[PDB]
Amino acid sequence: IQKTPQIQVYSRHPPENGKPNILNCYVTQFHPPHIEIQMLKNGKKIPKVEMSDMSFSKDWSFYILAHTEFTPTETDTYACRVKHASMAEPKTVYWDR
Amino acid sequence: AAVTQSPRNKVAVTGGKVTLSCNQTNNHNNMYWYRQDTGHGLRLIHYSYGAGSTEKGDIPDGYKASRPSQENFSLILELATPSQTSVYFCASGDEGYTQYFGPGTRLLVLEDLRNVTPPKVSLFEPSKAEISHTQKATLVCLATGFYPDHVELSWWVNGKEVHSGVCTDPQPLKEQPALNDSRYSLSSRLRVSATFWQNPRNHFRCQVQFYGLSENDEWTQDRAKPVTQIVSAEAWGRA
Amino acid sequence: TQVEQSPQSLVVRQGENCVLQCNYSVTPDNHLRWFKQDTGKGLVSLTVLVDQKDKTSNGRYSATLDKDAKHSTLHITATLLDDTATYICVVGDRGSALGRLHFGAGTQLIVIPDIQNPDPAVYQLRDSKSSDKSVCLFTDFDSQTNVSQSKDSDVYITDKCVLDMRSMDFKSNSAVAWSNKDFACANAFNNSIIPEDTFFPS
Amino acid sequence: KNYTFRCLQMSSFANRSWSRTDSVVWLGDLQTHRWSNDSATISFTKPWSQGKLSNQQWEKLQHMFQVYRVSFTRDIQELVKMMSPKEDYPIEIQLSAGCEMYPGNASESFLHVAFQGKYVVRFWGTSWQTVPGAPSWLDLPIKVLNADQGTSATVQMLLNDTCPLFVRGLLEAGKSDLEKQEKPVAWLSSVPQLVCHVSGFYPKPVWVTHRGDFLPNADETWYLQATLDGEEAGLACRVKHSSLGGQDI
Ligand SMILES: CCCCCCCCCCCCCC[C@@H](O)[C@@H](O)[C@H](CO[C@H]1O[C@H](CO)[C@H](O)[C@H](O)[C@H]1O)NC(=O)CCCCCCCCCCc1ccc(F)cc1
Ligand SMILES: *[C@@H]1O[C@H](CO)[C@@H](O)[C@H](O)[C@H]1NC(C)=O
Ligand SMILES: *[C@@H]1O[C@H](CO)[C@@H](O)[C@H](O)[C@H]1NC(C)=O
Ligand SMILES: *[C@@H]1O[C@H](CO)[C@@H](O)[C@H](O)[C@H]1NC(C)=O
User: Residue ranges of the domains in chain D?
Assistant: 1-179, 180-249
Q: Is C188 buried (19+), middle (13-18) or exposed (0-12) by CB count in 10 A?
A: buried
Q: After which residues is chain D broken (C to N over 2.5 A)?
A: 192, 208, 229
- CATH T-level topology, domain D1-179: 3.30.500
**Looking at the structure, do residues B118 and B201 belong to the same domain, yes or no?**
yes
Spatial CB neighbours of B101, under 8 Å, sequence gap ≥ 6: B3, B89, B90, B91, C42, C43
**Looking at the structure, do residues B120 and B28 belong to the same domain, yes or no?**
no
Phi, psi of B93 (to 5 degrees): -170, 155
Domain stop point among B111, B141, B168:
B111
Domain that holds residue B206: 112-239
CA-CA distance, C31 to C24, in Å (whole number)? 12
φ/ψ bin of D23: left (φ > 0), alpha (ψ from -120 to 50), beta (otherwise): beta
Q: DSSP code of D165?
A: H
Cβ pair A56, D92 in contact under 8 A: no
Q: Which residues pair with A55 in a beta bridge?
A: A63
B143 CB-side CA count, 13 A: 32
CA angle D9, D129, A32 (to 5 degrees): 35
Phi, psi of B67 (to 5 degrees): -120, 80
Q: DSSP code of B201?
A: T
**Looking at the structure, do residues B135 and B215 belong to the same domain, yes or no?**
yes
**Looking at the structure, do residues B220 and B238 belong to the same domain, yes or no?**
yes
| Residue C48 CB coordination number (10 Å) | 19
Cβ pair D138, D84 in contact under 8 A: no
Q: Strands of chain B (E only): list them.
A: 3-6, 9-13, 18-24, 30-37, 40-48, 55-56, 64-66, 72-77, 86-93, 100-101, 105-110, 120-124, 136-146, 151-157, 160-162, 166-168, 173-174, 184-193, 203-210, 229-236
Judged by DSSP in three states, B192 sits in: strand
Q: Which of D37, D42, D67, D73 to mutate to test the pocket of ligand 3 (most atoms within 8 A of CB)?
A: D37
**CATH code of the domain covering residue B169:** 2.60.40.10
Domain stop point among B111, B139, B169:
B111
D169 marked as part of a ligand binding site = no
D148 marked as part of a ligand binding site = yes
CA-CA distance, B109 to B84, in Å (whole number)? 7
CB contact under 8 A, C95 and B129: no
Cβ pair D186, D66 in contact under 8 A: no
Cβ pair A82, A91 in contact under 8 A: yes
**Looking at the structure, do residues B129 and B105 belong to the same domain, yes or no?**
no
**Looking at the structure, do residues B97 and B48 belong to the same domain, yes or no?**
yes
CA-CA distance, B118 to B226, in Å (whole number)? 6
Cα separation values, D154 from C54, C91, D10, D99, Å: 18, 20, 21, 16
Q: Which residues pair with A97 in a beta bridge?
A: none
C in contact with A (at least 3 C-beta pairs within 8 A): no
Question: D18: Cβ below 6 Å to ligand 2?
Answer: yes
Q: Which residues of C touch B2 (CB under 8 A)?
A: none
Pairing relationship of beta strands B72-77 and B18-24 according to DSSP bridges: antiparallel
D151 marked as part of a ligand binding site = yes
A2: nearest Cα among A29, A31, A36: A31
Q: Is D114 buried (19+), middle (13-18) or exposed (0-12) by CB count in 10 A?
A: buried
Cβ pair A36, A83 in contact under 8 A: yes
C3: nearest Cα among C87, C91, C93: C91
What secondary structure does DSSP assign to D11-50, as a single string? EEE-SSS-EEEEEEEEETTEEEEEE-SS-SS-EESSTTTT
Cis bond upstream, residue B103 (ω within 30): no
Q: Which chains touch B (3 or more CB pairs under 8 A)?
A: C, D
DSSP helix, strand, coil percent of chain A (3-state; round to 5):
0, 50, 50
**Looking at the structure, do residues B144 and B94 belong to the same domain, yes or no?**
no
Cis bond upstream, residue D85 (ω within 30): yes
Architecture per CATH, domain D180-249, reads as Sandwich (2.60)
CB contact under 8 A, A53 and D31: yes
Total beta-carbon pairs less than 8 A apart between chain B and chain C = 140
**Looking at the structure, do residues B167 and B214 belong to the same domain, yes or no?**
yes
**Looking at the structure, do residues B155 and B201 belong to the same domain, yes or no?**
yes
B89: nearest Cα among B107, B110, B71: B107
A94: nearest Cα among A39, A16, A48: A39
Q: Which domains are assigned to chain C? A: 1-113 (2.60.40.10), 114-202 (2.60.40.10)
Q: Which residues of A touch D215 (CB under 8 A)?
A: 8, 10, 24, 26
CA-CA distance, B235 to B141, in Å (whole number)? 11
Query: Which one-letter amino acid corresponds to residue C107?
Result: T
Query: Which one-letter amino acid corresponds to residue D108?
Result: E
Judged by DSSP in three states, B227 sits in: strand
Q: Which residues of D touch C96 (CB under 8 A)?
A: 144-145, 147-148
φ/ψ bin of C106: left (φ > 0), alpha (ψ from -120 to 50), beta (otherwise): left
Question: Ligand 3: which atom is nearest the Cα of residue D73?
Answer: 3
Three-state SS string across chain C, please? CCEEEECCEEEEECCCCEEEEEEECCCCCCEEEEEEECCCCCEEEEEEECCCEEEEEECCEEEEEECCCCEEEEEECCCCHHHCEEEEEEEECCCCCCCCEEECCCEEEEEECCCCCCCCEEEEEEECCCCCCEEEEEECCCCCCCCCCCCCCCEEECCCCCEEEHHHCEEECEEEEEECCCCCHHHCCCCCCCCCCCECCC
B88: nearest Cα among B57, B117, B116, B112: B57
Q: Which residues pair with D196 in a beta bridge?
A: D188, D226
Domain stop point among B91, B111, B131:
B111
Q: Is D147 on the interface with B (CB under 8 A)?
A: yes
C186: nearest Cα among C144, C119, B127, C194: C194
**Looking at the structure, do residues B102 and B174 belong to the same domain, yes or no?**
no
CB contact under 8 A, D199 and A54: no
Q: Which of D8, D11, D61, D71 to mutate to test the pocket of ligand 1 (most atoms within 8 A of CB)?
A: D71
Three-state SS string across D81-118, please? HHHCCCCCCCEEEEEEEEEEEECCCEEEEEEEEEECCE
Pairing relationship of beta strands C107-112 and C9-13 according to DSSP bridges: parallel
Q: What is the resolution of this structure in A?
A: 3.0
CA-CA distance, C126 to C43, in Å (whole number)? 39
Pairing relationship of beta strands B184-193 and B136-146 according to DSSP bridges: antiparallel
Q: Which chains touch C (3 or more CB pairs under 8 A)?
A: B, D
Report, in angstroms and rounded to the nearest whole number, the Rg of chain D calculated over CA atoms. 22
Q: After which residues is chain A broken (C to N over 2.5 A)?
A: none
Spatial CB neighbours of C11, under 8 Å, sequence gap ≥ 6: C110, C111, C112
Q: Which domains are assigned to chain A? A: 1-97 (2.60.40.10)
Q: Is B76 on the interface with C (CB under 8 A)?
A: no
CA-CA distance, B210 to B152, in Å (whole number)? 7
Cα separation values, C19 from B57, C9, C13, C65, Å: 33, 12, 14, 13
D193: nearest Cα among D226, D215, D239, D224: D226
Partner residue opposite D144 with nearest CB, options C28, C30, C97: C97
Q: Which chains touch D (3 or more CB pairs under 8 A)?
A: A, B, C
Q: Which residues of B touch D145 (CB under 8 A)?
A: none
Q: Which residues pair with D201 in a beta bridge?
A: D222
Note the ligand closest to the C-alpha atom of D64.
Answer: 1
B194: nearest Cα among B140, B139, B154, B141: B139
B188: nearest Cα among C137, A31, D179, A4: C137
CA-CA distance, D134 to D138, in Å (whole number)? 8
**Looking at the structure, do residues B96 and B147 belong to the same domain, yes or no?**
no
Question: D77: Cβ below 6 Å to ligand 3?
Answer: no
**Looking at the structure, do residues B142 and B52 belong to the same domain, yes or no?**
no
Spatial CB neighbours of C178, under 8 Å, sequence gap ≥ 6: B142, C134, C135, C136, C155, C156
Cα separation values, A87 from A4, A6, A44, A62, Å: 7, 12, 22, 16
D133: nearest Cα among D145, D115, D147: D115
D75 marked as part of a ligand binding site = yes
Residues 199-218 of B with CB under 8 A from C: none
Experimental determination technique: X-ray
Number of domains in chain B: 2
| Residue B173 CB coordination number (10 Å) | 18
C55: nearest Cα among C41, C65, C45: C65
Q: Which residues of D touch C95 (CB under 8 A)?
A: 147-151
Phi, psi of B62 (to 5 degrees): 85, -5
Question: Ligand 1: which atom is nearest the Cα of residue C28?
Answer: 23
CA angle D52, D55, D57 (to 5 degrees): 75
| Residue D88 CB coordination number (10 Å) | 10
Query: Which one-letter amino acid corresponds to residue C126?
Result: R
D197: nearest Cα among A13, A16, A71, A24: A13
Partner residue opposite B55 with nearest CB, options D81, D144, D147: D81
Q: Starting from the edge strand earliest in sequence, which strands make up the sheet with C61-66, in order? A: C3-6, C18-24, C71-76, C61-66, C53-58
C137: nearest Cα among C100, C185, C103: C185
